[PDB]
């Protein structure tokens, strides 16, 4: 493929070195047999000790050189393959991170991980084995066709018959092989998703006692994969058998033609006999060449999913350059309506219009499914409204630079998500540099410093995967501290006090002590919504 070559372009010098070493190895291998035959003749009667040693020495020299060249070639090819694999992995992972949030609802994390882990090796393993066989077979064919010019009319007869017979069936075989490879990869990804889900939610599965059910599901997926593998292997075996039959038929035809020519005085018995060995080698070499070419094409074509992911354009507006040195923090919704892209024709918000001002606290309340978290997501520029505008300081929210925008507008999620690592890495997450005193001050502001000291390593204690080694209230306090580190101008609190006890909840009620930031509070406990300057009631996606 054109794209794979342009991707492997940074590896050109190593490929050139490998090609040079392969040429040298072929050169040595093409002359070893002459001295081997000289040794065999010298031993076979009329022994001469002097000429024996010379032939042995020449054989040793050529074998040594060819072996060294072959080893260098193999090393170069292996390194090239590994480098290409790593480059593909890096580019695919970098491209996945830029996609819109709707992309990750359609796909599954286990299947994406399977694409990263399995499809890339299939892409990369096309270099080592195929190139050497290709070059060796091409050299052998070119050399052997020249020797056979002893009978020119038979060669034209030959090139017209033996060569184009194999073209017809390989067109069908390559299509079938490519289809079966694509199906195999899809089945492998589906099987991997089962392990992903079962291991990720182990505690729930154990609490419901459903381990054997997951084992059965995985075994069914494995059975599907095994059936696809068997189909591929059987088809390959049939193709090889048909090739052997065709080769035998072609061999019989020229044996007949050559015997007919010999009786007519065209050539002697010696010339005819030497012609058949070249015939037998040439047919096999041509068949191997075509088979390797078809295999390369099919293996390259079987991995279109990775290529499609690596070039997909996300459904997002063009990046924004705005980064004012000063920001007021006025947020305006102007007739905003929204429907989730994965399920349109089902509106969630319908013509919302409100204003948030600095120095004031606004409360947004409503039943379950009203659309409060959707409003929070729209405010953070995670989704685009289908109608209306969202403005920050009288300019569209999408026109601000990404890092600046998410440095100035910060939120606390409904169910906070932590990452594996230390406490001081989850706090100040996404910040290039942060001093220890800022981290400690933010932890004190979130009332999280009391339980941090009780841990064995302080702020360097390892938080488990997804924060699984903490209590829920402690995780929520860490999320609050993570939000408060960046002292943002606009702060969003989506059910930020659901898991906290009443004593800690009432202490954090002063979200605007400084009075220089815009605060939006989403809650179900009306006690916390009593002190808000402005109250917005949301019912079925409409204000009232």
């Amino acid at each position: 493929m054109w794209r794979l070559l342009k991707l492997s372009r940074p590896d050109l010098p190593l490929l050139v070195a490998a090609f040079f070493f392969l040429v040298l190895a072929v050169l040595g291998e093409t002359l070893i047999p002459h001295y081997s035959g000289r040794v065999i003749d010298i031993l076979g009667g009329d022994f001469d000790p002097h000429a024996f040693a010379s032939a042995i020495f020449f054989m040793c020299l050529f074998s040594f050189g060819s072996s060294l060249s072959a080893g260098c070639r193999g090393g170069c090819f292996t390194y090239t393959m590994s480098r290409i694999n790593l480059r593909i992995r890096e580019q695919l992972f970098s491209s996945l991170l830029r996609q819109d949030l709707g992309f990750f609802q359609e796909t599954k994390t286990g299947e994406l991980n399977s694409r990263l882990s399995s499809d890339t090796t299939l892409m990369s393993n096309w270099l080592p084995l195929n190139a050497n066989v290709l070059l060796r077979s091409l050299v052998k064919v070119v050399g052997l066709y020249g020797f056979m010019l002893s009978i020119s009319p038979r060669l034209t007869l030959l090139s017209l018959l033996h060569m184009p017979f194999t073209i017809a069936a390989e067109k069908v075989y390559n299509t079938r092989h490519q289809e079966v490879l694509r199906e195999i990869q899809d089945a492998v990804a589906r099987a991997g998703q089962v392990v992903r889900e079962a291991v990720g939610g182990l505690q729930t599965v154990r609490s419901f006692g459903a381990e054997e059910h997951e084992v059965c599901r995985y075994k069914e997926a494995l059975e599907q994969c095994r059936q696809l593998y068997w189909r591929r292997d059987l088809e390959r075996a049939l193709y090889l058998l048909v090739r052997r039959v065709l080769h035998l038929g072609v061999q019989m035809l020229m044996l007949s033609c050559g015997l007919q020519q010999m009786q007519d005085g065209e050539l002697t018995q010696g010339s005819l006999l030497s012609f058949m060995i070249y015939q037998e080698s040439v047919g096999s070499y041509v068949q191997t060449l075509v088979y390797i070419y078809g295999d390369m094409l099919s293996n390259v074509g079987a991995a279109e999913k990775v290529f499609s992911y690596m070039d997909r354009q996300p459904n997002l507006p063009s990046p924004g350059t705005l980064a004012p040195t000063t920001l007021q923090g006025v947020v305006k919704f102007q007739d905003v309506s929204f429907a989730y892209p994965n399920r349109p024709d089902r509106p969630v918000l319908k013509g919302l219009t409100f204003t948030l001002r600095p120095g004031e606290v606004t409360a947004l309340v409503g039943p379950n499914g009203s659309g409060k978290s959707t409003v929070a997501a729209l405010l953070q520029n995670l989704y685009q409204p289908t109608g209306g505008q969202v403005l920050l300081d009288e300019k569209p929210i999408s026109q601000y630079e990404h890092c600046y925008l998410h440095s100035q507008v910060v939120s606390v999620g409904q169910e906070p998500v932590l990452f594996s690592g230390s406490v001081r890495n989850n706090i100040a997450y996404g910040l290039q540099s942060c001093e220890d005193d800022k981290v400690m001050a933010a932890a004190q502001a979130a009332h999280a410093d009391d339980f941090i000291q009780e841990m064995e390593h302080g702020i360097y204690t390892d938080v488990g995967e997804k924060g699984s080694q903490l209590a829920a209230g402690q995780k929520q306090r860490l999320a609050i501290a993570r939000a408060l580190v960046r002292d943002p101008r606009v702060l969003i609190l989506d059910q930020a006090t659901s898991a906290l006890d009443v004593q800690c909840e009432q202490a954090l009620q002063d979200w605007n002590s400084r009075g220089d930031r815009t605060v939006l509070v989403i809650a179900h406990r009306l006690q916390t919504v009593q002190r808000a300057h402005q109250i917005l009631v949301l019912q079925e996606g409409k204000l009232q």
Binding site: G28, L31, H34, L61, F62, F64, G65, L68, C72
Partner: peptide, 25 residues
């Protein structure tokens, strides 16, 4: 001898160079 003598010494030089580089590495 089917191979010419110049090619033989050329391959001798190649093998010597490969051994020298392998020892130098």
């Amino acid at each position: 001898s089917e191979p010419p003598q110049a090619l033989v010494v050329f391959y001798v030089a190649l093998t010597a160079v490969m051994v020298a580089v392998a020892l130098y590495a």
